[PDB]
Ligand SMILES: CCCCC(=O)OC[C@H](COP(=O)(O)O)OC=O
């Protein structure tokens with residue numbers, strides 16, 4: 001329930017529903033529609 005979020009944040013990412021301009025969607029975080037944006 002936490003490891004995808006942690007892996008995202010440990011690899012320069014932030015969990016968002018929509019990535020910011022210039023960010024890449026590299027995986028998902030935990031929780032619904034929470035996307036890892038780097
Ligand atoms: C508000 C979440 C608090 C943790 C929880 O209830 O566990 C359920 C899921 C488990 O992780 P998933 O990525 O499978 O949703 O956590 C995320 O909502």
Ligand SMILES: CCCCC(=O)OC[C@H](COP(=O)(O)O)OC=O
Pocket residue numbers: 017018028033
């Ligand atoms: C139906 C579950 C969708 C979760 C997903 O990872 O993929 C779809 C994403 C969901 O994120 P949204 O921000 O669009 O809701 O859509 C991206 O375009």
